[PDB]
Amino acid sequence: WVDKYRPKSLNALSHNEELTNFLKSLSDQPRDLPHLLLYGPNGTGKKTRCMALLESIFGPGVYRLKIDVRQFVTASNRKLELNVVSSPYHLEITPSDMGNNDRIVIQELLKEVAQMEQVDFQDGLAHRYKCVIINEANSLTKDAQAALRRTMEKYSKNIRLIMVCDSMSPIIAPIKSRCLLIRCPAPSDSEISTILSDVVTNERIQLETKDILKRIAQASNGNLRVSLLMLESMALNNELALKSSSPIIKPDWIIVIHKLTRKIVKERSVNSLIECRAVLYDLLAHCIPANIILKELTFSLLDVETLNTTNKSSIIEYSSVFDERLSLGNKAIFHLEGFIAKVMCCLD
Amino acid sequence: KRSKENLPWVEKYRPETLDEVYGQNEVITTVRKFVDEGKLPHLLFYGPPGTGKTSTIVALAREIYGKNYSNMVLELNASDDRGIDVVRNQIKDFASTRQIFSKGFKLIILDEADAMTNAAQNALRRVIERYTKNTRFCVLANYAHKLTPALLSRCTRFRFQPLPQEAIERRIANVLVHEKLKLSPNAEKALIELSNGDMRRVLNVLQSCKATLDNPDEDEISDDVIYECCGAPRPSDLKAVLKSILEDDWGTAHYTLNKVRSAKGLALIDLIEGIVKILEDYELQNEETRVHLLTKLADIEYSISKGGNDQIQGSAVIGAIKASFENET
Amino acid sequence: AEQSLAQQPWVEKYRPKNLDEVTAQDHAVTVLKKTLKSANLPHMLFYGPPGTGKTSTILALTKELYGPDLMKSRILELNASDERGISIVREKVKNFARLTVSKPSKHDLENYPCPPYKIIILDEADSMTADAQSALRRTMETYSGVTRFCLICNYVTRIIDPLASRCSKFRFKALDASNAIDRLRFISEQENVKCDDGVLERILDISAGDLRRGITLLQSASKGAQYLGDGKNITSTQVEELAGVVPHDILIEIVEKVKSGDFDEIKKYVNTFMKSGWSAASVVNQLHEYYITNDNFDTNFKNQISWLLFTTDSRLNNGTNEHIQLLNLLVKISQL
Amino acid sequence: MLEAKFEEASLFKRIIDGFKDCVQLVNFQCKEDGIIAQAVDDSRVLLVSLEIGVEAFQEYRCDHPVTLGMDLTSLSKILRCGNNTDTLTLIADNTPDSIILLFEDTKKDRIAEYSLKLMDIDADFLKIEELQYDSTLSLPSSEFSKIVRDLSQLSDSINIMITKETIKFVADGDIGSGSVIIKPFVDMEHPETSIKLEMDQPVDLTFGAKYLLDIIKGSSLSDRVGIRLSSEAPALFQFDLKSGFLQFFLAPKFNDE
Amino acid sequence: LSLQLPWVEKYRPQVLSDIVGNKETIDRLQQIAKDGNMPHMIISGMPGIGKTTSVHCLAHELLGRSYADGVLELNASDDRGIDVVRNQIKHFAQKKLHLPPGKHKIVILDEADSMTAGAQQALRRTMELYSNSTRFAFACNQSNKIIEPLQSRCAILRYSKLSDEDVLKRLLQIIKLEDVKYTNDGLEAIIFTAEGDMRQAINNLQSTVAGHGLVNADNVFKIVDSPHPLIVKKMLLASNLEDSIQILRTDLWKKGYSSIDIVTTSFRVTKNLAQVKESVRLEMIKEIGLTHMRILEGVGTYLQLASMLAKIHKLNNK
Ligand SMILES: Nc1ncnc2c1ncn2[C@@H]1O[C@H](COP(=O)(O)OP(=O)(O)OP(O)(O)=S)[C@@H](O)[C@H]1O
Ligand SMILES: Nc1ncnc2c1ncn2[C@@H]1O[C@H](COP(=O)(O)OP(=O)(O)OP(O)(O)=S)[C@@H](O)[C@H]1O
Ligand SMILES: Nc1ncnc2c1ncn2[C@@H]1O[C@H](COP(=O)(O)OP(=O)(O)OP(O)(O)=S)[C@@H](O)[C@H]1O
Ligand SMILES: Nc1ncnc2c1ncn2[C@@H]1O[C@H](COP(=O)(O)OP(=O)(O)O)[C@@H](O)[C@H]1O
């Protein structure tokens, strides 16, 4: 299972030994740990390594978390509410929840936790800094990013900012500079296969040989969490018996995107474009990020073999163009429909 | 403690009267004849930043009433609230009553009225002409499109042309008279060309080169001191870089660019402008060259405005110049 | 105090405290030091690349001008956390500017030269709106005898045109391995870092136009070296491995795939490369460096590849997907 | 130095409450004669001028003339956080800096020392009240307040007309009009209810209603309001204090006709 | 210290005959004034043609001495919300006044395009019910901003721009009344720079007269600064890129014009460029808008306008 078998220290990380050694090096002198920024592919194991370093530098009681609710108010009467995952040694925020009010949340909560200090008994007040974890920092707004970058050096003996994000590109240069940059490479096939082997020997699933885990690792593209989840779903559907002949369970949206690519490559007409717009509406309406839709659609289109070199080249060019346009707009369908129309005009 | 010598040169040399406002002769003369004849209609000053608008209107307010101008003259700059609820109460009450000290027409100076909402200007549109025989309005602005056409029509338009070379030279001479200092002729030409009409940049870089002398009483401000104070590229190495880009190959051109931009710590944004200004004089025997030469350079400048990289943009400038100087052959 | 400055990263541990420790911009610190003896301090506008010394030199100038006692009562600082809106810049900034300078104590008056004006510093003015900067104009203009403004920014274009004339401009030049190696040498000697002969040059070349990144890089390298306890020196490979710098061998492999290959092979290799964590900006920078510094290609290839790399960088700077942009760049550079 | 110890506490509060919401920034000049002040309205229409001698102060000590500029909002904030039973002392150092308001109770030791940072107001000290007025009058504050706040409900302008032994307040608006005509008469049993009038020329001139409603707020200080009117001159509304006086200089509204 | 009234106000017509605007509508208003049965009317047109002065002379001639109590004019300075239009306008509508037989009470709502829709909605019935005593008269600049019922109840009266003949006639009248030395070339230049604006023409006349005394082409072209949109229209129609660039440099940039104003004026000129086709107009507008977006981010140098002109020339030439 995903949540059950997870390392809870630095001596238990069983992949990317170089990154583990670097983390142990950063965990020797805690009082001199600068701000950290983890970047790498999705589902690489960034939050678990963060909470493992946090346990290595603090006591082992950092894993007991609790959710709290904080209510802020903007310039107007519109009251906003946020959830904070607090622990007696740190606090985790997801500022991406608020649409365009992140600048208020940051400049309020970070300042509040920076001014005062932490008191708790577990010799009444003397303690070290407090840690703030920021999930999905790549989605931060530019003004919120400026506020967060400025609330780093003013109060440095109290707050240590450990941010994590994939696709580090939407991070302004000052934040990229004033903090340490740690990369988290996806584990190799020989290591994710060992992870799966440990899971299958611990959960007692009936497998024939080691080729099933290899196929799972090859299908997951390197994503550890998705591989574990697909393995669990295969074990559930196959009734506690994994065999060499099992259909790889692709998520529903992957199958929808594949059917969309088939519809695109088969019929190049505006009548098909109407159904394409309908499918994109049904996909976006069910909480799917438009950039992920675009990436999957483009890669599945390049996967199509009946297209020559020039078609795939113009396709990747239009995809780069509409991906640039996607990060500068709000109505994502307005760009997705245009990209589909462009690929239809390109194919014929 | 506090005295006139502590103020920066931007404000220390503020023109007290209209006689100390050079350059805009054709507007100062008309304004002086206005105040002499006795008639002064609603004025609208429109000019680039740092030309003399606020100084001219303050000198006019001093000349009309007296040495105490901010007594019976109202002044609404961008620091005060100028909503519709303000033009309703405050401006109307000021324009509907008499003065407290003397018997004359009242003056209202709406400085930087381009930062007013459309509703505020529409409300002012009628109060500006309902009370004419008692008050006069003076609208100062830099962007003549923010004002509605109605308010723009009711006021006499006076444009403040950028300061020509002679006016800035006279002002430099007057400043060098009061402050013990010496300035070179070629340094004067470089300062004039760097001014771009801005009278404030002149005094700023002048104070800078005076401070960077270590003895501002004997040594003269050469062109190198001025070029160093603002970090602007000298025409010499600028033309050298342009020639090396146009003639030499790729490796040595990139090498000389990285050597010139690292000898004094220049910026690519200034090198682009300098190369454009130097190269606008060439006689290209085709129209397709200049089109690309401008388009690619403008794209690179807009990308620099966001600060993506530092060397990729330099090689992009080199490539744009080289590819544009290819349809000629 | 001293134990407090010991318990903080090297960025804040070696932040310059006076106008003499900032050894990067000799053109501006000269004016700022000459201002000390005089009293005509103009409205300042520091602008330049990130991590250069602006916020670290304005504080040093303030400390040297007023002193640790009057500093907390004679300056106002609006950097990013305060609500800098039109209403705030109309009310609070104006109230503090149109305010009487405090009485300097005999100790401060005797030791530090106290000028007859306060200081309002608006740090990172590129985040303010246009109306706020427009309102700042006359507020900074009329109270010029008791208040002087100091703006700081990374992009001068973001500031409106009128404020670009009132303030005196000061461009902070970038920090390469030529005029910033002395500070890094001094810090490495003060921290007893067993550096190699020319690793500092590589550290400064990695942090193009930035020093704070180089400082934290050296700190992390020294920490990783001390963890092992071997006491040996740090190599250039050791520091470039953790600086995000992509290894040279896999870069040569990338170039070999570009020199010849169909769409499918390049796509597969790009996917395999993106499987690992590599910042697309660094990969684009290294590809550009390798292709430009080379002399094996033709000018008709060099101009096109420069334009393509510039377009890819402009795309990546808007916070887009790294995988799609890198794949498009590699396909377009292979098309030539 | 400057030390001004009042006899009571609510005296300065009631004094400031006269022009609380009428002016924003004032500048007190303290000399050996007493505290003087004059401040212009935001719209530059009326001017408040206050003079308080050394009679209302329990103790007064001022060596050289000092000027102290300050806003009225923060001053009212400081006066509100003081209990009305203490003793108030204004304190200023050698050079003009943050003024020190000190509240000291008379029974228990309660030292409330508040500071107020001065504003840098341009010292354009004005000299009015030397102009010979055409008409002078004096009448109880209650009657003036009643008349003005009754006429303010019908219009925004009020025409005052002083004719031969006649005072006329005329309000003309949209829903209707109103005219209050009074005559000078003096009583022996009640010398405070008498209305006095000394004229040289009949004077007819208009004012706004908002400024009159803001001026009549000062009726809580005295009971006999004096009104001095003159053509081409600001109308003088004077309230006589026990030590000095508070005078509003209002600007008349001209007529297009 | 006496300040003489401006030539725009000192010579403001107080008689409906002195209006030199559209002859047909002015004659209609004249006949209505001589008769008295004035119906609700909306007057709209270009800024500075004489709408407000026309309706004011109409009211003064219709009510004469009763103008003090018969007319209730509400401008943009006065409040025009729902509260006032429901209370004060209604109370003035039912105000019993004994006027001459063929006369009526008039309500002058100037700048009608600035009122809220709810105000006009509430005003509909208040105007329709008391037609026997109240005759509203709206005077705005954009008739589209008025709601449909209010506009339909009243009789619309459009106003066109003043032709050069009317402007020259009024200018000659002013010169004859003011005893000023003038030449034909100066008056033609004033009319050309007036872009059909009576107030602007009179203001420029007074300016040049007080500035130089003699109204000649040199003086006006010296201190009137010939209109902006014409230079921009001339710039966008050059044959080669070099001529358009030289025009932009000498006439626009060197004379101290902000880049944002040049971009906005070029957009507005291309909006009404009837010479070139539709697709080329749309593409030019798209490129001008791209340049506008680039200007609004702060970067507004000469290079951006030069590249904009280069793109327009590349588009129009192929
Ligand atoms: N014509 C001029 N002659 C002499 N000095 C001038 C002139 N114009 C500007 N200056 C100098 O520039 C300073 C500021 O000029 P201002 O008139 O205040 O600028 P401005 O016209 O208000 O333009 P803005 O408001 O920044 S858009 C003055 O105090 C002078 O030192
Ligand atoms: N010129 C310099 N001289 C010495 N140390 C410097 C210099 N510039 C940067 N540093 C070091 O780098 C740290 C960061 O410098 P800062 O001035 O705070 O950065 P910055 O100029 O504010 O860049 P920003 O905030 O992104 S615009 C300092 O505390 C020093 O340790
Ligand atoms: N036809 C005209 N004949 C004579 N003078 C005119 C004429 N039209 C306008 N004027 C002059 O213009 C001024 C009055 O114009 P207005 O009525 O204010 O213009 P408008 O029609 O109201 O347009 P607005 O309100 O400014 S948008 C006076 O100075 C008149 O002398
Ligand atoms: N060293 C490891 N050993 C076993 N499982 C691991 C290891 N690293 C990561 N995982 C798996 O990764 C999953 C959590 O992924 P997560 O950290 O949420 O991804 P992301 O870093 O994108 O947030 C856990 O279920 C855990 O089983």
Ligand SMILES: [Mg+2]
């Ligand atoms: Mg100005």
Ligand SMILES: [Mg+2]
């Ligand atoms: Mg900074």
Ligand SMILES: [Mg+2]
């Ligand atoms: Mg009108």
